[PDB]
Amino acid sequence: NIKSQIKRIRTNERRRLRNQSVKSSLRTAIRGFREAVDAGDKDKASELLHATSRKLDKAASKGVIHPNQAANKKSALALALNK
Amino acid sequence: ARYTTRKSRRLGVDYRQQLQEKQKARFSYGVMEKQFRRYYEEANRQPGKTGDNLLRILESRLDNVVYRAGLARTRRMARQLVSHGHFLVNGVKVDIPSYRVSQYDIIDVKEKSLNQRILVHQLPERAQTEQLIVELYS
Amino acid sequence: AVKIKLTRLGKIRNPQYRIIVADARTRRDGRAIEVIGRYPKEEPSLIQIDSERAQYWLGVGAQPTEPVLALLKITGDWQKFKGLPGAEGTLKVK
Amino acid sequence: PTIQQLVRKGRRDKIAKVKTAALKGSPQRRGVCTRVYTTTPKKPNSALRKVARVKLTSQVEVTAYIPGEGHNLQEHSMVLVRGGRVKDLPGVRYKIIRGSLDTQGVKNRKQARSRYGAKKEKS
RNA sequence: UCGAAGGUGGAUCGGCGAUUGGGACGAAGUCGUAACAAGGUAGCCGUACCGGAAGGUGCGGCUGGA
């Protein structure tokens, strides 16, 4: 080692735990959407789209998920909601 | 490498016959066989007769010019003069016998050197034997 | 991003540069995008540049390196691009 | 052949015989001395020829011919090995360089000196 | 859940091996004299059996047979 690698190891512990937290929060949001749809619950699931699609594009604004990924999630949720 | 009467004595003119005309042509101008090989391979690249270009290249040598100029007797005498740098070419010290002068080249002598400055109008044609030395190689 | 460099094509103790547009990442004698010009062992340094291509690459936003920025300022393609009144007229040969 | 018969199966190159296999594409090769002996040659030639078996570093054992006149070479001495045939002896295709490593140069030799590794005597 | 490495019946490829089989080259030391002339029984091909060894003899073939 010897280098400024010792500093950049300390960052990659810090900056993982930020991005791990946001990626996991999106999964539980998207997961709870699908259980609302599979119940046949329209008024609850219609609310959960605007909850999740808010939360997806905020994670793109962080620079975590990248906007093309964030867009293709929102597309999948809306086409699921319409049926 | 400089060679440094008999070598001429064997040839006269002081595959059997082919090598002998090359031998006088070489030891006249004081050339080493590797340098003589190079002037042949340049001569055949040039247009015209390939043999006639060879004698043009050997006559173009700056020390040969001194011999013709007669500034120094005995072509081997001029080797001692030229490398010592007595001569000058276009206001530059040529300390090199292998210098090949072109057209409009001005050969002057250096100041002092006390023991007459003739100019080159063109590279002289053969009129001013080659076919042995051409048929020697290749 | 894109950058105007010099590239050392000469033999030992006798460099000749050619003024190359390339990436910042590439090795010194690497692949150019375009060779613009050429350029130090003379009483008068020899400098030649395409004025048309220099204006194109600077207009895109190719950042000159520090010693190239001298040569552009001399020949006066930098002042055409920048549009400041120092103008052009330099060099000669002899 | 017909030209279609060449298209189906092409023209194979004729397989080249490598000349000196023990050297492994090297000009010289070292080795011990595991025998030193004499043989009678083949042919109308007659004489005693000094020969030696050399296990090379390449781990191949082959005869060698010691050029010159007389040799030190006892058992378990280290020896270079050249290449190039001696056509009187059947099989023998290598030679021992003289004057290199252990093999000392030929004594009193004043002509063809480089081949036999004899240093020039006092100018 | 997938998952490296590590655990414990064949396939392919090689090293050494008691011992044994033919091959090349060398000196020519014995045993013969099979082929080249009708080579002293015309030779050779294919099988078959036999014999120290070259070879011998059946059946069919061939001319590269006097």
Next chain:
RNA sequence: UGGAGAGUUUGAUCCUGGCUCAGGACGAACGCUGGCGGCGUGCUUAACACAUGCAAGUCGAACGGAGAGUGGCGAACGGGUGAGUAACACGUGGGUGAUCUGCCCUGCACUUUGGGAUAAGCCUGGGAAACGUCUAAUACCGAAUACACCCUGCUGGUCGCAUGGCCUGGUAGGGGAAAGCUGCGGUGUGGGAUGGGCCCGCGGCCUAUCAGCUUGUUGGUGGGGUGAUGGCCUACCAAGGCGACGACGGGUAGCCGGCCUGAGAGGGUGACCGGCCACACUGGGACUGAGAUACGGCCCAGACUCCUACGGGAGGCAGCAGUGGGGAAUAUUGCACAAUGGGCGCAAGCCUGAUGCAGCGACGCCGCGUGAGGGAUGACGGCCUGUAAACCUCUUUCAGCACAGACGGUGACGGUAUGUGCAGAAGAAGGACCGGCCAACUAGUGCCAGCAGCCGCGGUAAUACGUAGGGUCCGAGCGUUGUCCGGAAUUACUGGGCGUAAAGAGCUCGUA
């Protein structure tokens, strides 16, 4: 715009047909032998193991503070090596309506508003060594605003190569950001430029003593997933895919621009220099990020080696030097960031074993030196040489010491190249071969000692062996081994053959 031949089967001849010579080269190595310059070049074998120093840091115009520490960028570039890979890896062609791009510049619009922590600092334990309570930010976070932008619904026109694209199309629903301190920045979104990623057309080694291979296998539909299209992945139906035009196997291999040869077509090779690929002790991962095979990062598993006060740890030169091995063989533990390239900073600067140079080795290709005139009855000397020397003047390149001295606030090269001066020949020539081919001839040893590229020389008079003279051929080099092309029309497409020379299946039938 160039295309030679020669020897050798026989008493002799002609043909077929090998084998061997002349030629050119090299990342070469050995001998014998070396005087200096210029210029490139230098572990081809063990991707074998590595002791020491250095090869990536930088900013106080972000921040507490009083070098270290948080933070931003860089660290994916530069440099190394050829293990792996017969593959979309590579080389040339296209495609991307199937997509990404930090920094850079150059349009447009904004930089609103609030809070919570945590290293440093102190006090603890742990040990030979090395890794419990407080305070800031351009660190990190709830919101607001954005109509460019992302998602979904209903609909306008055009373009065409089918999915579909484009006109920021028009609508109406729901949502997207930011940072400040002494001139540089910061978020969002049009455009341009760079770099990539992913598909396909064809091209490029050996093998049938490898003939069957495949089950996520070939396709479809609905989902998941990626920057993006795709059995890329997954769950259900269909039963297909590839192969004699060599599939699936085994062997070898970095590929190419080029480079060696040849008149060409070909054959060999992939050094330096310049692209693309793969790999970083061996394997399997992912994280951070605009970008990762992440050399000098992380985690785990193995193999190997160090420090130890035995409690615990740490490390990987296929960076540059270097060391030991292995080899017939390959370099200094150099100097400097002056120049060109790169990173960070507003800048001054600070790093750079990239790079520019120096040393070493005739390893290669060039260029100069070792003397120039005159000199005879041809001294002496050696042997059956030589106008050479002897001796009379002369020039001083390189070497030697002197003085001046660079071109590229300051240059490593370098008091170097280079110029002008002081004398004096003083400091400077080897190495093969001479039987014929193929240039050069005469005087101990006995088929022994030995020589030899093929003929073949030695059995008492040797142009062939060993030595001495004398000659050639080349000369700071000359010979010999190893390797590839040529000669070889000797794998023949250009350009060959098969009654007897090697060569017609024993004959017919018939699939591709």
